[PDB]
Curated annotation (Swiss-Prot), chain A:
Keywords: Autophagy, Cytoplasm, Cytoplasmic vesicle, Cytoskeleton, Lipoprotein, Membrane, Microtubule, Mitochondrion, Phosphoprotein, Ubl conjugation, Ubl conjugation pathway. It comes from Homo sapiens (Human). The lineage of its organism: Eukaryota, Metazoa, Chordata, Craniata, Vertebrata. GO terms for biological process: autophagosome assembly; autophagosome maturation; autophagy; cellular response to nitrogen starvation; cellular response to starvation; macroautophagy; mitophagy. It holds the Pfam family ATG8. A lipid is attached at G120 (Phosphatidylserine amidated glycine). A lipid is attached at G120 (Phosphatidylethanolamine amidated glycine). This is Microtubule-associated protein 1 light chain 3 beta.
Curated annotation (Swiss-Prot), chain B:
The modification Phosphoserine is found at S4, S8. Changing Y9A: Impairs interaction with MAP1 LC3 family proteins. This is FUN14 domain-containing protein 1. Interacts (via YXXL motif) with MAP1 LC3 family proteins MAP1LC3A, MAP1LC3B and GABARAP. Interacts with DNM1L/DPR1. Interacts with GPX4. The YXXL motif mediates the interaction with MAP1 LC3 family proteins MAP1LC3A, MAP1LC3B and GABARAP. It comes from Homo sapiens (Human). Phosphorylation at Ser-4 by CK2 and at Tyr-9 by SRC inhibits activation of mitophagy. Following hypoxia, dephosphorylated at Tyr-9, leading to interaction with MAP1 LC3 family proteins and triggering mitophagy. Dephosphorylation is mediated by PGAM5. Phosphorylated by ULK1 at Ser-8 which enhances FUNDC1 binding to LC3. Deubiquitinated by USP19; leading to hypoxia-induced DRP1 oligomerization and GTPase activity. Belongs to the FUN14 family. Integral mitochondrial outer-membrane protein that mediates the formation of mitochondria-associated endoplasmic reticulum membranes (MAMs). In turn, mediates angiogenesis and neoangiogenesis through interference with intracellular Ca(2+) communication and regulation of the vascular endothelial growth factor receptor KDR/VEGFR2 expression at both mRNA and protein levels. Also acts as an activator of hypoxia-induced mitophagy, an important mechanism for mitochondrial quality and homeostasis, by interacting with and recruiting LC3 protein family to mitochondria. It comes from the Eukaryota. The chain holds residues 10 to 26 of 155 of the full protein. Changing L12A: Impairs interaction with MAP1 LC3 family proteins. Changing V11A: Significantly impaired mitophagy-inducing ability. Signal peptide: none annotated.
Length: 120, 17
């Protein structure tokens, strides 16, 4: 997915429900999360991670750190993870608690990411 | 490495502790 075009070109909603079913069966200690760049301002690079499988005991601040580094964003470059469309950039919480709080209709969690929370 | 694609994948591309 990181070398191809935008995530929907790889996998659709019902096929992401199949991903949740397979991952919950094989590795239930990891949490199913989707990640996508903000459509209103595509300022950040096309380093399309698309999804991640986070261990239960990883902090949201630690997830932010690995994802900021994988997106090549140095300390001077602005960056935010928007859980279900809203920022949690300052929070220390374990990913499972953030998950059960913001888990969507079919068992996945969403994170939109951006250089600023809104622009247009 | 594997990161984001299919099935048996290590999508966070790290060994947890």
């Amino acid at each position: 997915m990181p070398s191809e075009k935008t995530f929907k070109q790889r996998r659709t909603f019902e096929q992401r429900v199949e991903d949740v079913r397979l991952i919950r069966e094989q590795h239930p200690t990891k949490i199913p999360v989707i990640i996508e760049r903000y459509k209103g301002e595509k300022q950040l690079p096309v380093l399309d991670k698309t999804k991640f499988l986070v261990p239960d005991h990883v902090n949201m601040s630690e997830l932010i750190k690995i994802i900021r580094r994988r997106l090549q964003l140095n300390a001077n470059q602005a960056f935010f993870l928007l859980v279900n469309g809203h920022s949690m950039v300052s929070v220390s919480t374990p990913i499972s608690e953030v998950y059960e709080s913001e888990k969507d209709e079919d068992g996945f969690l969403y994170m939109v990411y951006a250089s600023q929370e809104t622009f247009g | 490495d594997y990161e984001s694609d299919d099935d048996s994948y290590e999508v966070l591309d790290l060994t947890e502790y």
